[PDB]
Amino acid sequence: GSAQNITARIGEPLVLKCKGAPKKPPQRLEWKLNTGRTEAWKVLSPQGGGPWDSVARVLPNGSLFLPAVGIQDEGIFRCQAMNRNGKETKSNYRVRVYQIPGKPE
């Protein structure tokens, strides 16, 4: 992949994978995503255990599933994992919603 462009619409479901992790989650992994304008950046984990209608949920295989990505959910998805070999796997996927910003406040 490496910087993959993914288009989506407000209220549309979207799923992303974290390059590096196999079918099942081996060791601990840290995911980070930047959305909004600057104060929306949040850290994704292998266990969201939270409301999907508000944000999204994390798959057991180490993936990410969203029920409906809103215009505010727009941003960039970045994942980082580490294998037993010592090397780490990087994953960057840019996501764009329907409506876009122009003059925020």
Partner: peptide, 7 residues
């Protein structure tokens, strides 16, 4: 500017 990604 926008994470790793950049166009």
């Amino acid at each position: 500017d926008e994470f790793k990604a950049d166009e």
